[PDB]
Amino acid sequence: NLCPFGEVFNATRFASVYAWNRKRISNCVADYSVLYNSASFSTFKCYGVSPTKLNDLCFTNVYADSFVIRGDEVRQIAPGQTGKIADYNYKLPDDFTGCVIAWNSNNLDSKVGGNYNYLYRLFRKSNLKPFERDISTEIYQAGSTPCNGVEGFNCYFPLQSYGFQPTNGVGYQPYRVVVLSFELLHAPATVCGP
């Protein structure tokens, strides 16, 4: 009854950050030593808990959120951070408890001529609330006049493509990010460690 963290990290395809994928973990035992001992991760930052004792704790609800972002934007997946990705695509609460894991995926998500299948939200009316997902593709009115469904003067499409090319710098190369959120409620803690 091992927790299926394998199909999250080892998944062939990842989702866009604006449409970040979420997997629910329940009724299993999780061996976190497989994760924090593997040096295949560029960033591994845990808030409210360190990974070493994660094998001795039990939680009620675990969420694994997978997406792909820019390298120089991995710093934005953290509590109390501001920026395009944090404010408009994926927000973390200031009281976040859990881990953020990110690794370079240039060999998998980049292609010659540009990979444009990954999108991110550029504009929004208000900052994103934590863990809230917005997949609306309506025209963003940037001020005085409305848009009527067309772009142009102060009227832009909310989503923009990333354009991942393999010869780009580490700051432009794609990175795959998994956010493990641990939640303790007045509900039975179904996940545990060995």
Epitope: D72, R75, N106, G114, Q165, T167, N168, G169, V170, G171
Partner: antibody, heavy 124, light 113 residues
Framework: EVQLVESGGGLVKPGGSLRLSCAAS????????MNWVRQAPGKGLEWVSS????????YYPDSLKGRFTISRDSAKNSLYLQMNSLRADDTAVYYC?????????????????WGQGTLVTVSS | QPVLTQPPSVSGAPGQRITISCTGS?????????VHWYQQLPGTAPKLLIY???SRNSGVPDRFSGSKSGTSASLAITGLQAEDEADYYC????????????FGTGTKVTVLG
């Protein structure tokens, strides 16, 4: 159209600190990576530092031991390099440079445009 | 800090073709990163001459060409002229955050005649 002008070079004592400035014009400043490179008199080129378009990610080589700091200011479209614990080996002509566009295939890989450069001489 | 090795100087008559080599490792050129060539005239700042390991910057004559293969790259000048006397540097990229931009040794080009 693209213009990069450096300033602040001069004399500094060994172990001292200096601040080099680079004003940029002719392009959207906040859309490009910025870089600092240096060339010792009669020697080759050495990349010194790099900063992203948003200015929140900084990159340095391990040889500098983190005594160099790169910063950018969009309110003035300027790039700043702070050098600390300077030594005689750091005497060189320093150039600020603009990287390739994020739309291109070599974003954050080279130095498309260069400045006039400024001479920094570390001497007692 | 690793570098890219080039011949210290290459010379030729002002009618022939010369080549400048640029040897890298599996970490910079063999890792899938292109090579840029910069030309520095005496007393002036370096200028971008070649980007993408084959493409010519604006204002660069067709006499200059670039190529890369394996862990190495080359810059070819056909029809040497007296204005070509300068320093030529190759440059590539390393994925490691401790290296990143890797510069070439530099080559002094001179014309004879």
């Amino acid at each position: 159209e693209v213009q990069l002008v450096e300033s602040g070079g001069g004399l500094v004592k060994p172990g001292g600190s200096l601040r080099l400035s680079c004003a940029a014009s002719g392009f959207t400043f906040s859309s490009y990576y910025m870089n600092w490179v240096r060339q010792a008199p009669g020697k080759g080129l050495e990349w010194v530092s790099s900063i992203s378009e948003d200015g929140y990610s900084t990159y340095y080589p391990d040889s500098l031991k983190g005594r160099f700091t790169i910063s950018r200011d969009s309110a003035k479209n300027s790039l700043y390099l702070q050098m600390n614990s300077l030594r005689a080996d750091d005497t060189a002509v320093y150039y600020c440079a603009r990287d390739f566009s994020g739309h291109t295939a070599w974003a954050g890989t080279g130095f498309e445009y260069w400045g006039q450069g400024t001479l920094v001489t570390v001497s007692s | 800090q690793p570098v890219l090795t080039q011949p210290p100087s290459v010379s030729g008559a002002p009618g022939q073709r010369i080549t400048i080599s640029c040897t890298g490792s599996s970490s910079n050129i063999g890792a899938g990163y292109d090579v840029h060539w910069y030309q520095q005239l005496p007393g002036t700042a370096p200028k971008l001459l070649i980007y993408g390991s084959s493409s010519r910057n604006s204002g660069v004559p067709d006499r200059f060409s670039g190529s890369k293969s394996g862990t190495s790259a080359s810059l070819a000048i056909t029809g040497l002229q007296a204005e070509d006397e300068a320093d030529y540097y190759c440059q590539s990229y390393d994925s490691s955050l401790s290296v990143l931009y890797t510069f070439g040794t530099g080559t002094k080009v001179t014309v004879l005649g």
